[PDB]
Amino acid sequence: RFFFTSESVSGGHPDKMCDQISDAILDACLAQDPKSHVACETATKTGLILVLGEITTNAVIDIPKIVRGVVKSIGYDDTNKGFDYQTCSVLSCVEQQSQDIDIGAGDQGIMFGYATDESKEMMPLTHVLSTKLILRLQECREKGILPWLRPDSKSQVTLEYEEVEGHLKPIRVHTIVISTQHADNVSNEEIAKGLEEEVTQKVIPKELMDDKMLRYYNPSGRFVIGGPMGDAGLTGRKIIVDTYGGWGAHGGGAFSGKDSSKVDRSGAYCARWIAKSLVHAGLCHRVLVQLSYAIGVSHPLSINVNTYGTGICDESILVDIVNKNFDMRPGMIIKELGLTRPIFQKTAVGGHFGRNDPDFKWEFPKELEIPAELKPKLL
Amino acid sequence: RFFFTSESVSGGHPDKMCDQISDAILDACLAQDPKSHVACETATKTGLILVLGEITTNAVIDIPKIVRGVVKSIGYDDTNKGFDYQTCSVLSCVEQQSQEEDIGAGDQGIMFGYATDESKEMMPLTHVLSTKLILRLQECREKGILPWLRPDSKSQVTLEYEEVEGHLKPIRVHTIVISTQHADNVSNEEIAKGLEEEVTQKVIPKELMDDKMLRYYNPSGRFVIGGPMGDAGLTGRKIIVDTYGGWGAHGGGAFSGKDSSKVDRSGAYCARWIAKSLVHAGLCHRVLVQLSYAIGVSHPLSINVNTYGTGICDESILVDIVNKNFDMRPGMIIKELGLTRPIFQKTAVGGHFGRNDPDFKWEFPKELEIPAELKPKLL
Amino acid sequence: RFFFTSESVSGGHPDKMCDQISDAILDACLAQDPKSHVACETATKTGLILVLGEITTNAVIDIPKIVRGVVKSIGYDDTNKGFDYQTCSVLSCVEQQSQDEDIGAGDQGIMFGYATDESKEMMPLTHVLSTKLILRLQECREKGILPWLRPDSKSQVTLEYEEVEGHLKPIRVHTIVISTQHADNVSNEEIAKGLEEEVTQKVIPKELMDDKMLRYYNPSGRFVIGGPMGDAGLTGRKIIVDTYGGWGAHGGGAFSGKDSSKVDRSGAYCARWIAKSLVHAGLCHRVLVQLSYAIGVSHPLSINVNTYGTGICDESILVDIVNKNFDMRPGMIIKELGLTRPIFQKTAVGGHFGRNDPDFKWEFPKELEIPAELKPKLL
Amino acid sequence: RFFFTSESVSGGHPDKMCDQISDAILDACLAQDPKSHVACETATKTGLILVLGEITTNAVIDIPKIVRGVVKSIGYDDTNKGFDYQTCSVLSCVEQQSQDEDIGAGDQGIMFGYATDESKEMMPLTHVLSTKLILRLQECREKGILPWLRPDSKSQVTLEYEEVEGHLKPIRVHTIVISTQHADNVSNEEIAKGLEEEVTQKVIPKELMDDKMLRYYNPSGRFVIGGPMGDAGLTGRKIIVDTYGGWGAHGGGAFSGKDSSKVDRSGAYCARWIAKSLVHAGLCHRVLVQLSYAIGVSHPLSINVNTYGTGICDESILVDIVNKNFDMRPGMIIKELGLTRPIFQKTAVGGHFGRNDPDFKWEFPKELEIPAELKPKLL
Secondary structure: OEEEEEEEEOOOOHHHHHHHHHHHHHHHHHHHOOOOEEEEEEEEOOOEEEEEEEEEOOOOOOHHHHHHHHHHHHOOEEHHHOEEOOOOEEEEEEEEEOOOOOOOOOOOEEEEEEEEOOOOOOOOHHHHHHHHHHHHHHHHHHHOOOOOEEEEEEEEEEEEEEEEOOEEEEOOOOEEEEEEEEOOOOOHHHHHHHHHHHHHHHHOOOOOOOOOOEEEEOOOOOOOOOOOOOOOEEOOOOOOOOOOOOOOOOOOOOOOOEOOOOHHHHHHHHHHHHHHHHHHOOOOOEEEEEEEEOOOOOOOOEEEEEEOOOOOOOHHHHHHHHHHHOOOOHHHHHHHHOOOOOOOOHHHOOOOOOOOOOOOOOOOOOOOOOOHHHOOOOO | OEEEEEEEEOOOOHHHHHHHHHHHHHHHHHHHOOOOEEEEEEEEEOOEEEEEEEEEOOOOOOHHHHHHHHHHHHOOEEHHHOEEOOOOEEEEEEEEEOOOOOOOOOOOEEEEEEEEOOOOOOOOHHHHHHHHHHHHHHHHHHHOOOOOEEEEEEEEEEEEEEEEOOEEEEEEEEEEEEEEEEOOOOOHHHHHHHHHHHHHHHHOOOOOOOOOOEEEEOOOOOOOOOOOOOOOEEOOOOOOOOOOOOOOOOOOOOOOOEOOOOHHHHHHHHHHHHHHHHHHOOOOOEEEEEEEEOOOOOOOOEEEEEEOOOOOOOHHHHHHHHHHHOOOOHHHHHHHHOOOOOOOOHHHOOOOOOOOOOOOOOOOOOOOOOOHHHOOOOO | OEEEEEEEEOOOOHHHHHHHHHHHHHHHHHHHOOOOEEEEEEEEOOOEEEEEEEEEOOOOOOHHHHHHHHHHHHOOEEHHHOEEOOOOEEEEEEEEEOOOOOOOOOOOEEEEEEEEOOOOOOOOHHHHHHHHHHHHHHHHHHHOOOOOEEEEEEEEEEEEEEEEOOEEEEEEEEEEEEEEEEOOOOOHHHHHHHHHHHHHHHHOOOOOOOOOOEEEEOOOOOOOOOOOOOOOEEOOOOOOOOOOOOOOOOOOOOOOOEOOOOHHHHHHHHHHHHHHHHHHOOOOOEEEEEEEEOOOOOOOOEEEEEEOOOOOOOHHHHHHHHHHHOOOOHHHHHHHOOOOOOOOOHHHOOOOOOOOOOOOOOOOOOOOOOOHHHOOOOO | OEEEEEEEEOOOOHHHHHHHHHHHHHHHHHHHOOOOEEEEEEEEOOOEEEEEEEEEOOOOOOHHHHHHHHHHHHOOOOHHHOOOOOOOEEEEEEEEEOOOOOOOOOOOEEEEEEEEOOOOOOOOHHHHHHHHHHHHHHHHHHHOOOOOEEEEEEEEEEEEEEEEOOEEEEEEEEEEEEEEEEOOOOOHHHHHHHHHHHHHHHHOOOOOOOOOOEEEEOOOOOOOOOOOOOOOEEOOOOOOOOOOOOOOOOOOOOOOOEOOOOHHHHHHHHHHHHHHHHHHOOOEOEEEEEEEEOOOOOOOOEEEEEEOOOEOOOHHHHHHHHHHHOOOOHHHHHHHHOOOOOOOOHHHOOOOOOOOOOOOOOOOOOOOOOOOOOOOOOO
16 A cells, blocks of 8 residues: 555646647648658747757648647637737748658667556556546636636646555545646635636546545645746657656657657557557556667567566566567558557647547557467456 | 666767756856756757756856857767857857745656666666766767767667566676767778777676677668757757666656756655665665655655565555655755755766766765664665 | 938837847947947847847846847837737847957948038938937827827838029928827827827928828828737848938948947948038038948048038048048047947937937037138038 | 949858848749749848748748758858858748739838949949959859859959049049958968959959059958858848949848839839939939839839939929839839849849849830930930
């Protein structure tokens, strides 16, 4: 029995605003040219958005217009809100190419896949809640359920656990944090009310909820003026909220703004896929698959499956099962997971994993050919 | 028995070049004004360095000159090398200002501490080697031991392991990767020779070395023109090479460019400290400590110590020990670890942890009060 | 008898906004270090101000804060107005240094001095009115005499003339133009009313005024959302409104953002001085002096005084008188005209010439030694 | 009898490099879409080019690639030269838009036309030589006639005059200046030798040449490098070299980067046309025509023809003859002068006037319906 903490941030967060914008460009490209190559990043500050990077593509794209559209969508239409899509400046330092006239990996790296049967989404509950908490603030903001709300927001769900010999059963949410931006025309008392009633309660399960849970509502006091004004923001800086909330591991690879040819993304996705499959097939309760690649080398340089002593068969075997049933060549990962599609913008917020959108072909498990010795496997 | 892989990159790597530059500014500030507040980031691309962020300080600083000095130091003096400190452009978008130990943590977040007695440095061997491999390429480049060498370089050490009931004993280096930039006046064959003879051999222990060890020397073929030219680079994008090579966990917090008031750094450091202490004291073989904080709240919001079943004491008994002996208030963490001191530039390369520089006050363990009930623990 | 046209623009005009900002930096520098060297320029667009250039100085300056202060002063405090000093972005790409009489002209060039006794200010009436017209719109805006007014504005005064054997006597204002920005709460009819009554009438002399005089009040229709938003603006792009409204000549030298060591400014100023003196001493009715310099050469490379046949003395004599009484060495020009002073910001709007501010040491004539053969000349 | 000075600069000059780049974009646009609207500017500093402005067009353009191509063409291969087209950074802040005779002038303004029969090109000899001097340095650089030469260069031709009855007859070149950039592998003595032998002598007529003529060859001493590195450069800053070398007048309107719908260009061109015609028809020896426009008003709001007493009738007639034979509506000017064509890049250097390129439809005069009473005029 122990406690754990995870966090998440809203799409109004400058760091995440970048992630979004970057993947907006990518989508824009794949839309016209699926074979596009996009390795681009966004940086934003006081009154500015600077898009910088490289893109090989045939697609005729209007970058500044895409950018602005994303900022608008996020809700930044007023300078008093801290950002204005209509009046802000957009510097493009992207070097575009025409390219006009299987697949060794494009870069070397390390990538991680994680999965836990503690939740339906095969994700750490601690992370799920944290992010759901945030998606709800969006709903509230957009739908008018809480009109005083503003885009730049942040959350944190630390919760209690227990481990039944490797199986994680969560008990209760020990403490809770949420720091949102807001209009000046709202009472501190009025905020707490709305936050508890219309977000916390409506997202946190009653089973885990208590009279006994701690509450931290804008403990920094007030938060009217925010957004990218004052703070600086960059692509791929929220790498952990993008993934597993620090539960598994990370390879260091920022996902957003990178096309699927980048092993950093593909490998990370395929890794999730494997893991999600491995726990589905009842081979284990908890897994952490690690993949690794060499620049210019098509096949994976190394492979590791770390089940937390939970997995019934054993790791020498698992590592094999994976290899037999999965083609981990970047080129094929793209094909199998349909990563040439324009689905990546929506990936940029509320986490890349745990979401069962149809286009997220890595969240639907595979069916794995198993040696007959382990035909008795699990629930 | 199993395999694992970790990676590292050189200070010539654009992503890391930023990390360095950012921390160069920080140092520059703390030099004159220790009470300085710096939340600043760097971005670079083809011919350009863009410094953006915010910093409250009394220090009179020459940012462009600092920047250039860092680029020069790294070795980028020629456009043919891919970057020129003398000729490149420097855009400053930093907003400069003029401007107790119970201070509330100036942000919310999650932070991780890791330690393993598998090595003298209390670090994952896989990571140690990977980074040592890189530091040696520097030595060679700078000292002229391999003059054809160039700054932009990358490494990857995947190695074989065994676990003796929680204790990690490494067996052999299964495979090795190293992709360096170089002058066009080199023979592909000549590179492999020098790489094996003057780096690999002189860093990798003979005990772990063998004839069946795999070697990947610039498998991307050639690599003459590189650096920030072609690639884009940002601060805090190499968060994993900066820490534990994906062995433990991460909170998502980019270290570089942030002053020590930022919990993302302090908490991460203090966490390492705890861990390093916890296995000094023979309480365990392997630990991962997780800290967590709330914005505006001085005390840590939550705490967790995950020893990998290697801990003699049993789990909750020591979460206590930590609390008793450590003051995890950000304000104190600065004082105790002497984080007001301009030591942060050198932190920006070759990893923040595992290095026993005197100024790294978090690498020298603490001495902890222990209930006498625990007289039997570890060597 | 003939007609002529000249124009002017307000300090809200982006092109002029730059000129101002640039000279704001200069002033800021000379304030601390009179021996400062400043060759810097400003560019502005939609949400952005980019300062680029070079400055050798000991002065410790806060450029972004200076910039913002200038924009504020001009009245751009709202995004709806087209610009916001509070929310806009400021990119500094200027390279600052620490500084390590008969002295070399710092650059080669060609410069012009002009003067006409047609007016008290020794300036073309056509230009005087045009600019006065604009200064009045400022007065009205600032003083609240016309609160609906907005900063970005423009004017144009085309005037009828007659020449009495070289002497220009103006007859009447043939046509008039004025295009101002404004709040959207104002009626088209209400604008024309206020413009005629509170500016035109209060600036244009009744002697020159008529019932037949043409009037062009925002003929582009509406003009609510203007400023640097939409329109690109640069330093030294309004070189003619800065000087003589196209009456004399120009050397091409942008004045603003350049310190007084730059012959482009000094020579131009000294030239005005000479001219103003030459017509004061009753040597002529109308003069256009041209100066010319060589890079690294202290003395003027060439000299020319073109009186429009209005000069009693004959030209060969004049250019002598000039030489005898004036020290046209850049080094001296600075000393004599007190150009080490922070007076240059206010020079950046409403024209560099014709204004009898005490600090404008080039508007107060000299007393010249004249051959006794021609004590009979003009009033 | 008197002296006069004019100047010019090479296409390597940063200020002029911008002018070129800007008009390169324009051409690029008109190429696909003649009805394009382009109001864009370039700014350059160290290893950086910033393109900013607005363009309404259907044309699909690759701005960074065009830019780079222009810089290359100009000769900046080596960061060693002060600029490198291959390695420099390109920031695009241009706001691009799809597109939704007798139209109103787009903007208000003042414009000038000048012509002098002192030379074949109907231009001031002082300016012609100055610029020819520079074109020759190009020839030499490009053709290898002087391989040590480098692109950033500057010239200045001050020459002696006489006017006989309003007719300017030039006598001799009093002094000469030329400051060129160069390779470090060449001597100061060797430089002087070349410029005198292979430029000065091969451009300056021997009739105007002599032994007493002054020579200023890199008086700033050395000039190994240069370019945009260490100088700042902007579009439309060399407005005088672009036109008449300060002989006539200027309206303040920067030509380059503006499409022909901009009266600043059209009016200036049409003005030259008129003047060139007026002196061709033997109506006078020397003319300066001034045009003037109102925003949104199609017809010219004012008109003036200043012949320097060198015209053969009153000046009210001339003003008539102009009106009768020319349609000065911006809309028509475009049609008659074929200003929808991509000819504007080459205009950006060596002056907009005096060059008898076929595409320069404003340099070939018109035939004017003059009265029968004035059938006796001029040679």
